[PDB]
Amino acid sequence: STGSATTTPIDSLDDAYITPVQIGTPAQTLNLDFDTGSSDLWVFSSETTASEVDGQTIYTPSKSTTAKLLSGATWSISYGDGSSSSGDVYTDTVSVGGLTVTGQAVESAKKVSSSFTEDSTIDGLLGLAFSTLNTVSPTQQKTFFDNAKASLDSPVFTADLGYHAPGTYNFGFIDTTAYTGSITYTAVSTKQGFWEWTSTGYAVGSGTFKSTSIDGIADTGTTLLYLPATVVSAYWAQVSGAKSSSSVGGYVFPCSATLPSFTFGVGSARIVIPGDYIDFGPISTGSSSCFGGIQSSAGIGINIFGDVALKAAFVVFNGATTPTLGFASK
């Protein structure tokens, strides 16, 4: 089998992407944030504290003839941005772009933190990291991809995120019309539960390529590109007036700037992030100070190849017995 679904930016900055997901019978369609950096499929629901729901579409398990309470199971997750959610668990039928999994754990939120409430466009998350990170207790549950894998034509999914435009998540096949040149594959460590890999270096604008190993995670659920402070300083030093602002919480730059591109290495191959992808707009409405899309990972504890990086590529998440990651230009 295969599936193919369009993923759409939630706003004009590409802060996140939502993908429609069918849950239950009859289908209840929710727009979920596909997150290769976590491993829980959780949704706003009829069980969510009413004051914490503000415009989201909710899953109502009592209206699904295929929903079953997973007795005794609870979940609770905290994300890198300090947000969190928790609740109980149902199993139900879940379909993405025509690909159907029966008995998928659907984690129903009883509580969500303010950042989730405040974002009306995201109805929950669909985790696509390794199932070892799944938070369901006392019986850990599998991701949608893990459950679908054996049925797929090939044990892969691909992320093709757009810049200020829709893109595509495919399951079970590689669309050879969706990228240019060849796909370069690179080794993955699953030891931390992430799609963790090592970039071979970087360049800033038209500058020379610096060969250096940068361990990090491919994370569709993180907006920005988080890299070591040395790398980030080298980038922003090429933008007149750019500075790190402790008050704002990262590098800012004059909105009048033209940003240089940023290149990262995948083996001997190179992915170029155009300068415009690195502009996240005014820090506050009407400001002439703009927020940068490349930020320091210092104090995160890990480098994160988030959407800024991934949307410059066609990315293969190869879930074969030994997982790997592939990157192509597009």
Curated annotation (Swiss-Prot):
Q: Its Enzyme Commission number?
A: 3.4.23.22
Q: Which GO terms describe its biological process?
A: proteolysis
- What is the top-level taxon of the source organism? Eukaryota
Residue limits of the Peptidase A1 domain? 17-328
Q: Where are the transmembrane segments?
A: none
Molecular function GO terms recorded: aspartic-type endopeptidase activity
> What are the protein's UniProt keywords?
Aspartyl protease, Disulfide bond, Hydrolase, Protease, Signal, Zymogen
SS bonds (residue pairs): C255-C290
Q: Where is the active site?
A: D35, S199
- Hey, which family's this protein in? Belongs to the peptidase A1 family.
Please state what the protein is called: Endothiapepsin
Q: Which organism is it from?
A: Cryphonectria parasitica (Chestnut blight fungus)
